[PDB]
Amino acid sequence: VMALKDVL
Amino acid sequence: DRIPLQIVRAETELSAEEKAFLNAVEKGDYATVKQALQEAEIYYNINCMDPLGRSALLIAIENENLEIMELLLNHSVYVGDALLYAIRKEVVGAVELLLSFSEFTPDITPIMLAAHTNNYEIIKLLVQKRVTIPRPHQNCVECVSSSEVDSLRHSRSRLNIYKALASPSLIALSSEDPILTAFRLGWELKELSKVENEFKAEYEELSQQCKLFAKDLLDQARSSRELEIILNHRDDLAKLKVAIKYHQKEFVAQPNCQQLLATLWYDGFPGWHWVVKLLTCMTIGFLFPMLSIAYLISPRSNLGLFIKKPFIKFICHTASYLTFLFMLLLASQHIVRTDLHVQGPPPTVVEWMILPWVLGFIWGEIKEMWDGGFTEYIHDWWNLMDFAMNSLYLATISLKIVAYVKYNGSRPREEWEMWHPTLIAEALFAISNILSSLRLISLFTANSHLGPLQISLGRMLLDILKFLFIYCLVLLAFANGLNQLYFYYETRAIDEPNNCKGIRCEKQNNAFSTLFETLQSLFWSVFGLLNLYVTNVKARHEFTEFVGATMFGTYNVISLVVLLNMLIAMMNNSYQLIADHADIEWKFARTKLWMSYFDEGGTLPPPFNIISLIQNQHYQEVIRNLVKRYVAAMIRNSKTHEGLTEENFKELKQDISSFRY
Ligand SMILES: CCCCCCCC/C=C/CCCCCCCC(=O)OC[C@H](CO)OC(=O)CCCCCCCCCCCCCCC
Ligand SMILES: CC(C)CCC[C@@H](C)[C@H]1CC[C@H]2[C@@H]3CC=C4C[C@@H](OC(=O)CCC(=O)O)CC[C@]4(C)[C@H]3CC[C@]12C
Numbered sequence: 039v040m041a042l043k044d045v046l
Numbered sequence: 047d048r049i050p051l052q053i054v055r056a057e058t059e060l061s062a063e064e065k066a067f068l069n070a071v072e073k074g075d076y077a078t079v080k081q082a083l084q085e086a087e088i089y090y091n092i093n094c095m096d097p098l099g100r101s102a103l104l105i106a107i108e109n110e111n112l113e114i115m116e117l118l119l120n121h122s123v124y125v126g127d128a129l130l131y132a133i134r135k136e137v138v139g140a141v142e143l144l145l146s147f148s149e150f151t152p153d154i155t156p157i158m159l160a161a162h163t164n165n166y167e168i169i170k171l172l173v174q175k176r177v178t179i180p181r182p183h184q185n186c187v188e189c190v191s192s193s194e195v196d197s198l199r200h201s202r203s204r205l206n207i208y209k210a211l212a213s214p215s216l217i218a219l220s221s222e223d224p225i226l227t228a229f230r231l232g233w234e235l236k237e238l239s240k241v242e243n244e245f246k247a248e249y250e251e252l253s254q255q256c257k258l259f260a261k262d263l264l265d266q267a268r269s270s271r272e273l274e275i276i277l278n279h280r281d282d283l284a285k286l287k288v289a290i291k292y293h294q295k296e297f298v299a300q301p302n303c304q305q306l307l308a309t310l311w312y313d314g315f316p317g318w319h320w321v322v323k324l325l326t327c328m329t330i331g332f333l334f335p336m337l338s339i340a341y342l343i344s345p346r347s348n349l350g351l352f353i354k355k356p357f358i359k360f361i362c363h364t365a366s367y368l369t370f371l372f373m374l375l376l377a378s379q380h381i382v383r384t385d386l387h388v389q390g391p392p393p394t395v396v397e398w399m400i401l402p403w404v405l406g407f408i409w410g411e412i413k414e415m416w417d418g419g420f421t422e423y424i425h426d427w428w429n430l431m432d433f434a435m436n437s438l439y440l441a442t443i444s445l446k447i448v449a450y451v452k453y454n455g456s457r458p459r460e461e462w463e464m465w466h467p468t469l470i471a472e473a474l475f476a477i478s479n480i481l482s483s484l485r486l487i488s489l490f491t492a493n494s495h496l497g498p499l500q501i502s503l504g505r506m507l508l509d510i511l512k513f514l515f516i517y518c519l520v521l522l523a524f525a526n527g528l529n530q531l532y533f534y535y536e537t538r539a540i541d542e543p544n545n546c547k548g549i550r551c552e553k554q555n556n557a558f559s560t561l562f563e564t565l566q567s568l569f570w571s572v573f574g575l576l577n578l579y580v581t582n583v584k585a586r587h588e589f590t591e592f593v594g595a596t597m598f599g600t601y602n603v604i605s606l607v608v609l610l611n612m613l614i615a616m617m618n619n620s621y622q623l624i625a626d627h628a629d630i631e632w633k634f635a636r637t638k639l640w641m642s643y644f645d646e647g648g649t650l651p652p653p654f655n656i657i658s659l660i661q662n663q664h665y666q667e668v669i670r671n672l673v674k675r676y677v678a679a680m681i682r683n684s685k686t687h688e689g690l691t692e693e694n695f696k697e698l699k700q701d702i703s704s705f706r707y
């Protein structure tokens with residue numbers, strides 16, 4: 039399994 | 047005389063109050079729906095379905111209304127698949143609010159559906175919630191058990207996972223380098239279509255999608271420095287070699303990469319009429335031996351460095367091969383000649399001069415094979431041809447030595463047996479000459495005119511063998527029949543004029559006497575080289591001759607009126623599909639050819655051949671900007687269909703109403 043992540 | 051019409055499968059009828067409730071919800075009347083909900087709460091269904099199966103929350107989602115949506119969410123329960131329906135419609139506000147009978151297969155998850163819709167904003171919204179997607183396997187005990195339990199669900203789940211993984215937005219958002227991920231995923235999906243025969247189309251479409259995403263990402267470069275950073279990144283042009291390995295033809299044939307490759311290729315030739323180019327090429331080719339010796343003596347000298355340019359090196363190799371072919375021409379003329387009666391002759395002068403070239407070719411081929419490995423050698427179809435020609439040359443050299451050792455005296459040629467070693471040596475030498483002359487076809491790739499034609503011809507060769515199979519079957523059938531009919535009347539060679547037996551005589555005879563001869567006769571009748579009197583017999587049995595002539599005519603009709611024209615039609619159809627991509631394939635082949643002369647391993651021509659942190663940081667910065675322009679670009683390119691500005695204007699009226707109350 040691979041965990042998606044974003045790379046006033 | 048009449049057909050009654052009834053509802054075979056009837057659902058539960060909705061009450062009048064529920065029908066009015068659903069009509070009010072569809073009409074978007076907040077007051078009536080609120081009053082109905084209140085009277086239902088204090089009087090006592092909220093979770094009723096219309097015949098179409100949509101609960102009130104579903105119609106609220108479909109109507110793009112947030113107010114009553116919150117109204118039901120505050121009072122009602124059973125959200126169910128409302129998140130999936132909101133995601134499919136691509137409504138940001140409803141999805142955000144939801145986060146804060148079914149139309150979907152049960153294995154669908156919100157993240158995979160968002161990836162399917164290819165909506166960058168919704169995917170980014172969901173990814174921040176620490177979601178994850180399973181990694182599909184490539185043949186274990188679990189995979190087998192699941193396949194036995196339910197094959198349809200297993201295949202569909204695999205397809206859904208692979209469609210989720212192949213979305214350009216997901217790769218652009220959650221991958222370290224989208225280019226390498228796209229390459230690997232496209233290759234893997236391409237290999238999967240050959241295993242899953244039933245679903246091949248979908249997998250080819252997904253692989254094409256990945257390749258297109260990689261090419262489009264490459265298309266966003268604005269400066270040469272960024273292009274060099276992208277192409278030279280290593281985990282020498284390492285990225286270009288990786289793309290070549292994965293058959294990324296659209297990526298490689300991009301105009302900017304081609305410009306850079308042409309700049310590298312024509313080094314030392316600034317501004318490269320065609321007559322001047324021809325004169326320069328001939329002048330450089332005539333001087334190849336001097337350049338070779340200059341490189342041999344001292345690479346430090348300017349002359350030694352002169353051959354290191356890939357273009358000059360290619361010219362030198364071509365000139366050397368042309369010299370070898372020209373000196374092959376000299377042997378065919380037999381200027382030196384031979385006594386013809388020496389059973390074993392010593393090699394003539396021309397053979398001695400030829401000898402170094404064959405050894406150089408063998409050394410080059412064996413070194414190439416040893417370095418590349420068996421698999422790489424098998425991959426190139428040209429390498430097989432080189433192997434065959436080198437084997438033929440080796441057989442000729444061995445046979446000449448054997449003949450020289452075995453025989454010492456001289457004898458007239460007419461007395462030798464048919465399997466004499468000398469005759470086999472000469473035949474093999476002629477065949478090797480024919481094969482060697484045909485090797486020049488591989489150089490057509492460097493020309494803008496000839497090269498596309500060469501690639502197209504190579505692409506169409508698969509179907510020709512497919513037709514030759516059927517032709518061989520038909521030929522075998524008819525040969526069997528004819529030989530069965532005509533074998534009772536075989537004659538002897540001494541009974542024929544000139545003592546010639548067969549169809550290679552002045553008067554053809556015994557055409558269908560043996561199976562081998564029958565095959566030979568039926569082969570030559572395709573070109574009209576077999577006469578019609580060969581169907582006659584000496585005993586003059588008219589029935590047998592008529593039957594044989596009818597068999598021959600049926601074979602002629604089938605082979606020439608039917609099969610040839612079907613081959614014409616199929617070649618017409620195949621070429622049209624192939625033609626649309628000829629430029630890209632030709633440029634891929636040409637850049638494959640160019641890169642083989644970039645290294646310094648094989649600078650010498652064959653006759654003379656016998657004698658890290660800062661890279662990753664820069665790559666990330668360029669990737670950060672390439673992805674940013676990509677998401678901006680295709681949104682505006684999708685604005686060719688964006689006339690929804692007026693609907694947002696209504697949202698502005700709604701916001702003004704909200705400010706009012
Ligand atoms: C892969 C398999 C594909 C099969 C495709 C089949 C297509 C249809 C073809 C059928 C074969 C017909 C066989 C009988 C006729 C040929 C044998 C024959 O004439 O024997 C000569 C023998 C010996 O002289 O004479 C006869 O049998 C009597 C004279 C026949 C003359 C008239 C022939 C009529 C049919 C002409 C067809 C022409 C087709 C091309 C037109 C441009
Ligand atoms: C029938 C007999 C006369 C032999 C015919 C030989 C040809 C089949 C071969 C021999 C040399 C080959 C040429 C050798 C080198 C080049 C240069 C090559 O282009 C370049 O590398 C230079 C740039 C350019 O001029 O485009 C294009 C193919 C071409 C013309 C080849 C085309 C095919 C040729 C003419």
Ligand SMILES: [Ca+2]
Pocket residue numbers: 411414428429432
């Ligand atoms: Ca080779």
Ligand SMILES: [Zn+2]
Pocket residue numbers: 183184185186187188189
């Ligand atoms: Zn497994």
